[PDB]
Amino acid sequence: TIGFDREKYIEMQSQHIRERREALGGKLYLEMGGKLFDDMHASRVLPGFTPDNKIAMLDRIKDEVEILVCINAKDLERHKIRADLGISYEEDVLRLVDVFRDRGFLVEHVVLTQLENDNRLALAFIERLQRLGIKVSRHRVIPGYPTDMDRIVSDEGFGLNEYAETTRDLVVVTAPGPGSGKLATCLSQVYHEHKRGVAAGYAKFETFPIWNLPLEHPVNLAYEAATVDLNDANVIDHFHLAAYGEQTVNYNRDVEAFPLLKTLLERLMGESPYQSPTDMGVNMAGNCISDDAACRHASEQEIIRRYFKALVEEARTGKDSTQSDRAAVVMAKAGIKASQRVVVEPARQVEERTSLPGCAIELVDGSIITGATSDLLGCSSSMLLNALKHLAGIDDAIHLLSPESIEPIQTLKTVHLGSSNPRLHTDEVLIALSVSAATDSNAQKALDQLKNLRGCDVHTTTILGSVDEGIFRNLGVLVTSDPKFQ
Amino acid sequence: TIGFDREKYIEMQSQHIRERREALGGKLYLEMGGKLFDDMHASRVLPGFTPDNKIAMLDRIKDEVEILVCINAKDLERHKIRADLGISYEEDVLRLVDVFRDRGFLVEHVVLTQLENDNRLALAFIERLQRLGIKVSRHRVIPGYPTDMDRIVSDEGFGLNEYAETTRDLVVVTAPGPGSGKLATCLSQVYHEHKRGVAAGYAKFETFPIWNLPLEHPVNLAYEAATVDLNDANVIDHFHLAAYGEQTVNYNRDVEAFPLLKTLLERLMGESPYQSPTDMGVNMAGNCISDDAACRHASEQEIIRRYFKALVEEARTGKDSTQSDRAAVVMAKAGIKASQRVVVEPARQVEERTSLPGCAIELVDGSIITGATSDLLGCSSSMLLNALKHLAGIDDAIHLLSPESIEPIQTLKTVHLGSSNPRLHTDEVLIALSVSAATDSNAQKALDQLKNLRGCDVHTTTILGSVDEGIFRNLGVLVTSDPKFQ
Amino acid sequence: NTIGFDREKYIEMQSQHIRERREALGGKLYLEMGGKLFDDMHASRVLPGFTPDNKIAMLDRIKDEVEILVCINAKDLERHKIRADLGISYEEDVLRLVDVFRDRGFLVEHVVLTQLENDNRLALAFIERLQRLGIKVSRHRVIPGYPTDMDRIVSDEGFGLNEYAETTRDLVVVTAPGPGSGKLATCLSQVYHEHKRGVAAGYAKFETFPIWNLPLEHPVNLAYEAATVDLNDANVIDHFHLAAYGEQTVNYNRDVEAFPLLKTLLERLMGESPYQSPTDMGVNMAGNCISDDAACRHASEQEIIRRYFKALVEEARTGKDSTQSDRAAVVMAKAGIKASQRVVVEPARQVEERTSLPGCAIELVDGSIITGATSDLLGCSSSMLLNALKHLAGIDDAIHLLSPESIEPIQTLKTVHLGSSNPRLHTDEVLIALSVSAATDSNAQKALDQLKNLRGCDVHTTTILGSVDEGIFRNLGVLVTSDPKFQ
Amino acid sequence: TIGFDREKYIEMQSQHIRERREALGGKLYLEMGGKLFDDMHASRVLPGFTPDNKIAMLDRIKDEVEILVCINAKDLERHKIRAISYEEDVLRLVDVFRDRGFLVEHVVLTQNDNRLALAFIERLQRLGIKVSRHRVIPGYPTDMDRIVSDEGFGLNEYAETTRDLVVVTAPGPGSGKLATCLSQVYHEHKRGVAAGYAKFETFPIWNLPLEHPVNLAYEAATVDLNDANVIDHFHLAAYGEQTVNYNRDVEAFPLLKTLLERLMGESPYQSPTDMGVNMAGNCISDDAACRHASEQEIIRRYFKALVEEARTGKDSTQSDRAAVVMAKAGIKASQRVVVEPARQVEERTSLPGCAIELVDGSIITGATSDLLGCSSSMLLNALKHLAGIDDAIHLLSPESIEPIQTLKTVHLGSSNPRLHTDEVLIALSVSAATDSNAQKALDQLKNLRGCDVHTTTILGSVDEGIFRNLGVLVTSDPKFQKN
């Protein structure tokens, strides 16, 4: 079931953004915190929110939007790798430039922040961006930032930065990751705009946490589960509560950094338009939840997944249990147990009764199908075949794997590869199923059902090898594992 | 000036703790967070709270109290030191026993926590404790702490720990500092006492932050200025707000650790007596403010002092400005500027017009007295003599330093100690003053006033050496400094 | 597969020389046997003719004169210290050592628990598990002044608190799951307990590398330095041996620095010092059994190159600085070699330069260089394998051996069902497709028969291989190097 | 006692440098590794070697040499330091060399568009030093084709050095001074002028045994793990004679050797030893005096490591290493002659103890009393002995002591009224105006330079400062006083 109104969000969020820039005098510099194109978390947590949803929102107001990309000069020189896509910050900029241009957005400004020694790596980067039509501004390390208010709002502070001559009244400031100077750029650009007589302002866009959902709401709790540091931990926005008497949710980093930002905005704009970091924000995501219970369920399931993710990561690295302990605190605050992920206990029951690794899946149906380790099959392979048989309406005692589709694999494994265990992994079972599908109707009926395993939850009692992890990712199944090896 | 009722505090706090044990069955383990004996911060921040005020509170209920002292075993084999006193954690345990026994408190238990039997330095400390007639209980590392509730509340958890055979019904649990396992000791004791049929409970005692003072109160802000960690930053207690609808102050570390703590108390006691970390506490200090203005002023001044201490500390070590920036945020939340410390600008004016280090003091009187660098005197030495002259009513033109006292020190430094800078530091000026006082009456009257420099504020435009900082420490003078060397 | 080490001479010589050492030390010897015992793969690649189990096969000549003793640090039990080479604990490694030695009929009846104290109860749980398995277990304690205080150790307060192991055979080989199990300290204790009993006993060490009678700059010794992560096991000239005898020998930092302090410890337990150097202390004959120096030199020079690339890749995977690869590049210089001299390197990136896609190359046992390029159907490693198997089997290069009856169901699975726009086949699924093709076609069967002849062959790839392909090359016994680059 | 011939070093070392350029055709670029001014280590280890002995060596051939200073680009921006910064140290080297009258007109910038590095060029030219610019090479040691070409050494600006003996030095290690010499040799060979390279360093000494106390003392003075002395196996396989070099240079030699085969036609050197020019060991006059002094230094380094580990809370890595060096020399910590007398005082009194050894050889001790700290007691007793004053004489007047103690107790709230080193010396100075004995004692403060001291507890900053000013070498047992 779906609990987020995608279309309302596109209309409401983009309109709120437009309303904010009118209130700030006609031009807006908007800091985007987080992922713009691939927010899989938000898609699992707010069912109906597409991974691309923030981009589809901007798409509605595309003709009023400019994209500006920030990048730290140290991140160009350290060759800082972004963990998600596995590329350098340098390459991630160019990838952001053309992907926005693919979908028709105006991108003509890259700001190079924290520029120290000018360098040769950076010189080679400026001209590479000049050939692609984009003008690149040089921004400096501002003396006495963020405390020396007199120095900052002066030509000895923000005046050191080259002003990016933006064309449209709504500038969307984004970056490969944190530490890129987005806020600093936004505030610098506002300063220069005020020197030009152009009334301008700053605001922030972030999907999580949701200011107008309770701190104890599963959606907000699931965000805490998706985060590493205490800096990201949700708190009551005490600035908002002192000013208005209304309870809202922000987080440690932005609450800690607000008082210096408020002073900074006061000097840049006469008085501050914001009493709280809640006011500073622009997020309409909470107003577009169309089924609260569905989102509660979805994000409670996200929390449990995060706990097992952390345990498996800790087991692989040999790290202490910092991350899994934090996720357990979140579980306690949500009032949920790990048993509430319905594939956990049946998978363990299989391992109990067999003394061998176990496995369970929950179909779209709702049915729990398990898998067990045998001579022929590993438990995940066994789980796959059993699930495929169930939603193909195939009888439980029907074999759908030819002997001559099995023999060539096991012969290779034992005679040529020297494997003492002839158990088939998830990849080799699927191959043997696909070979069986040449002559068997049952096997073909089974194969056609692989596409229906998307979004389904799986628990295993042991940590999966690289092969099984691969296949389950390709089919789009969400896997958790008990943190044990084989 | 006095803004805190010491006597009311001793009555109210002792009574509230008594109420807490009666409400919890009749036996209480009370964790004492913070300095117990020389809480200088509290004395500056709450004029009327004495450095020993917590002990004077326990003195009211001396015959009902036992002291239990915790020490982490892993702190011994790192030779962890208490930076305040310049002694090891190991020597501080022996100190805490001695000073408590001198005041007539019953102290007979030391709990050594996190003990692994390959720690030869920790077991050497055990026999060192046993020969002085101290009972030593051994506490171990609990696997699955703090998440695995079944493991913790069992024989494989708290049942691993030895039991402190406590005589009195109110057990005050203290340590040389954080990480000593006070809380775990309290909870282990409750487990072992419930097994023996005795009703036992846990509560916490901390002076700061003050739960019933607003988050934006200078007293609570001063505490934030005294901290070096995000973990200690003040947050609204959201558990308390959700449960009762009343706004109270707590902080990150306890708020994050509360959900697992609450569950732990339920398993230990049957049901939880506490819906919040606020409920868990016992602090009554914020009901004992007799003058709000005096406390506000005192703690505003403290915020500025902390800001200058961080700036200096970063200059000595070469660290970045994280801590001083954090104090500036607190200055912003209090709505105060560094200039509100009255000794800052006069000291700076002395430097601005001499091109040499300057120095200023505020006497109890309110008078601002400065000192300048000369051929004979460093600026702090010069400031002292000027201040002593002012307090004693000695005319400005009078030289209270005979050339028979000055000459031997100069001849020692240049001829024998080979320094090229012959000007005197504060210690050698005070020696010269004391030598002069044997024959001169004015010098003796000046010496008499050193007494009255206690608690006065000082600013210098240059960082002091160890000697000068030592002398000001002895005289109880509160020194700040601009982050520059000579 | 060219032989440069005389393994029959070694089994004769080393056994005779070890036997000659105990007779010169009285009649009893406690021999410290460090390093890899059954699986010395490094020594098999560096000294061609040396079998991985050559140290054990040496003892199998004299097995009726040999008793094995297994040491274990008792503080590695509570710590749960694991041997990284296999994947089990130091506890279960002791049992794994006992039955693998009893397999070859060695008399094993003694286990020594060093660093034992009464406070450890998992340690005492292991004592009773071992007594039931049939072995006598002796208890060894901690010594407060060890090793720097000579006075406590000798008399009672040190070795007097250790339990004596009543060994039947006159040569006792002292073994442990890994470094730091008190194997040296056990050896010295048992000599003391037998000199108190009347029997003249002694201590010696069995190390295979570094080889003492080859020069410091010899590629064999250099290969061992290339194999070292720590800098404490760096090869040095034994200056003690140079000062005492005038002959230049090779030892290493750890034993050389331990020697002053250990020489005083020998005198107090035996009377005089039988050793004037760590070289004297040793017993290694492997240097005297090189039949072809040029073969050993070449084989070890190739090993150095392998270590360089495997460091580069390890740094590329874990995101670390170039510490150990720069170190491995220095020993490359000392040998006077470069990465080009691994003959499969330039051919592989010639493929990459002319195609702009990942490249790959193998050297066969016959000596030929067989390359592999990335096509639409195949990965470059999969391509290289099919090409190499064709050359080995005498099959014409124009012959397709992969039947589309075997190709299609994999391809159809990957694209329609798995949703991958990468229709390329890795080495595993190619070997599967070759196995299915072996039914209808006899050409695929003839290719599958020569996977056997790939053990020992060198491969270079221009890209860092995945887990699956590297698993397949390990299983085939193929020695792979890679350039530190991704696709 | 003197075991090193100072004047002989000045001649023989400068002469050997001169002969090296004659063997290498005519012009020499000479790398100076290590401390050039104020080498206090070499002064203690080779008694008679003055701290400025290397500067006085160059001073004899002043009119034949040119000082060239190297600085790495990366050392500027991180504010790289040594106890001020690398920033002002090039500005401090140049103006201190010209004081004695050396020719300094070249600074080479090692390791393009930089904001503070283009402005550092203009700082040099405005105060009279020409500057060459040297770039980073693709493949630093290994790629032999890229170095000896236009693609590497061809990129660098040639330094127009006047004199035929160029002393190449730097603020510290890793400044690429070796790479400068090799580039300069390349640039002159293209100009027809024959040029060459050699390395100058004092320690380790090549013609002393590996385990000689002097060589061992250098290992004891270094923090890095990969800085051990080794036998020069290159020299051993080539000439058959046993020689000492170190890890860093022995490791780096084969790549340096192929680089010298290209940049000079034939290989000039077969060893790191050959590469060297050191004559220090040929100038030792009393081996036993140098053996004794460097053994004492080893011991000092051990105690210094122990005290530093106790102060900082660090692991015992550095002190264990110095214990290993002691054992390599076969010496105990007790063999610092003032160690045992000092802890005998602590054995009897149960209070911190103290011992000095005078230039005489006499061991004078000091004890904790109600009036005096043991360091202050030891001082007065040592000063009495040196001045020929009887030990029973009180050289401190009651009117000098009283005002200090009254200040500490009555006014500065102390429990402990006993006098520290600085306080006893003020009292002695007050007493010197009235008493001849006190003045005769103060006179003797100059004769404490070089004297060894062991205390049983770690000294405070005040007491440590006093002994520094006097030039006293203090060692302490890693214990603090009871608080």
Swiss-Prot record, chains A, B:
Pfam families: DUF1846 (PF08903), DUF1846_C (PF20921). InterPro entries: DUF1846, DUF1846_C, DUF1846_N. Belongs to the UPF0371 family. This is UPF0371 protein DIP2346. It comes from Corynebacterium diphtheriae (strain ATCC 700971 / NCTC 13129 / Biotype gravis).
Curated annotation (Swiss-Prot), chain C:
Belongs to the UPF0371 family. Pfam families: DUF1846 (PF08903), DUF1846_C (PF20921). This is UPF0371 protein DIP2346.
UniProtKB/Swiss-Prot annotation, chain D:
Gene3D superfamilies: dip2346 domain like, Domain of unknown function (DUF1846), C-terminal subdomain. Disulfide bonds: none annotated. It holds the Pfam family DUF1846. InterPro entries: DUF1846, DUF1846_C, DUF1846_N. Belongs to the UPF0371 family. This is UPF0371 protein DIP2346. It comes from Corynebacterium diphtheriae (strain ATCC 700971 / NCTC 13129 / Biotype gravis).
